[PDB]
Amino acid sequence: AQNPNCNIMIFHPTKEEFNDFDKYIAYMESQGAHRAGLAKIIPPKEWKARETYDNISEILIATPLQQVASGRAGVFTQYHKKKKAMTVGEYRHLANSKKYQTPPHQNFEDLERKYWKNRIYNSPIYGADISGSLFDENTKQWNLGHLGTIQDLLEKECGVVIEGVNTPYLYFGMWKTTFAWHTEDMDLYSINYLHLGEPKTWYVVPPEHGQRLERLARELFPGSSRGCGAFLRHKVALISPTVLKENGIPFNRITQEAGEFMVTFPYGYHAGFNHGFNCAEAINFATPRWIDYGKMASQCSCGEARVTFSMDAFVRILQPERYDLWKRGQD
Template structure:
């Protein structure tokens, strides 16, 4: 295995960069386990450079007609390295029209000598000019016959969400495309439900990423409380709403460790559970992202407001009864990797193996079992188009789901008496903002509109 890491368990929490061989690249789940045993997860972020002969797609010359249904203009306010980011919806456009916009005088990338020079210009001019982000386009640009690291076919335990519950959540267990331009930004956040995410940069200009090591995530949360009091009043976990941004200088001045890395076209980035990350695009580009899960994520998932019944019953059977009674006191250890040869993986293989246990939905709430699939981008040959969804799926309801989030016009429904930083009950933490997870209750009805595409999925 060829990798750049810092000690067998990466005690310094630096961002790992790996160069798998073609043989190693065949098994996505196995390679994620390997990376964690190198300590990659401690940094919250890792970069994977695929084998030279591997290609996600033969050509990108035939995708100009992809529809970006709801571009988002990013409006930035703030100063002294502390900024707030809000979104304004723009009219639909095609990828071809969007590319023309990125090359306009207003939005084109300035001249720069190296990445450090461009980074300085980004932070110096951050509040000026509002870039437009072509975010949350349902679909994939991977060739259909591509088996390795295809975001639509990763084969991780997150597949249980669809297999056991019949639930498809766009951007979570189906891929999203993201079209970026100079200065389009993703603010500090962790992934919805503290899932993993994978981001592949198909083509175009690079993307700069920042990441705070998992063990310092709480310090970032506390740092953000003072400059964003309004957001804090609305939701104590407001960082998950992707609106707050602090510069590297502010992090340094407050003693918060962080890493930075540049992702170039043809490279993957993986974020790990509870890994805070942010970043910006250097110019016109196209990325594809999706969330995924591993057995190590299950204990993270137990403390967010989402039904974990199927995951715990199948993959942690020995702890299932304790968990049902609320007596599973397992504490999440950010430093521990996924076990490479454990009962988790054996159970998962049994579920996925032909002739294995029948897929049943008895471990899922009935509200989820009947949840109909939203449409995703359809591909005819090499042309992909994300259709307009005239009738969004009905929102999930019940005590296991949060109403999130006020920034996007929904509100954050917190459990009474529970503190987000509680060591015994973190269920009140806002677990993200996809509209398919929002609920409407008589006590929180405000007449506000649905969050729609203003609640982006993975970056």
């Protein structure tokens, strides 16, 4: 069995191997990449996402989210407080202000330590989940706005045509902005390109061990667990590496830099934080191997998780028994 210790693998495709996205994902899997839950892909040196980032300041962040924490330094939840709209250029200035800028530090490790020690005492503002793309239309390779859609994959595998579309989202981050422990909707893959700015640190639990993380989370967030049998779908809970190690949960960590892709694999729980002002783009995708994960994915039916239009058909076709209860939570 390839990659049996479930380590995060890093790939360096040539320009020729960068042509066929599906083929390269399948290649990574042949080498065991999926066992980690997360892989890094460094594009060939010839490749570029676009010519420059000099003209992005007028993009609008209609609903910036202030991430307010509750709990203890290693075990906390976050809620999102909506703020007034601002442009990317306004957000970048805010991120660089004395209140929100990255502190002096020695290296990524020192910064990680400062994050875990101090995150809860601050409320950073995240420009997350903005529909759009920064890939130039002429970029032909690994262009997240031109991937095959999940609806087309389900149709190809299962023969059923369904409604829905699949488009990318932009994330504008600052120091301490945080993504809570989660897997993707319907335990899909995700792909994330860091377009510009400061790094993003990731933590991941191998898919084969995801239920260990779920059991710990039920213990650590006991009111939340009573409220919902899949509350990590709410994307609000954080658990530090120190706490995971204390409880024997297998995981790995890696830092993504500007110009790099990350791929998360079906049912690979992940969480992380941004080092300073940055812009990432991400989208969900599927392969034939995903179908069995989609069929088995947990669902939030308490009402909190509230998701996209396109999830309806996935539930309806892959999980018909769950459909009626799930839809009541959507309505």
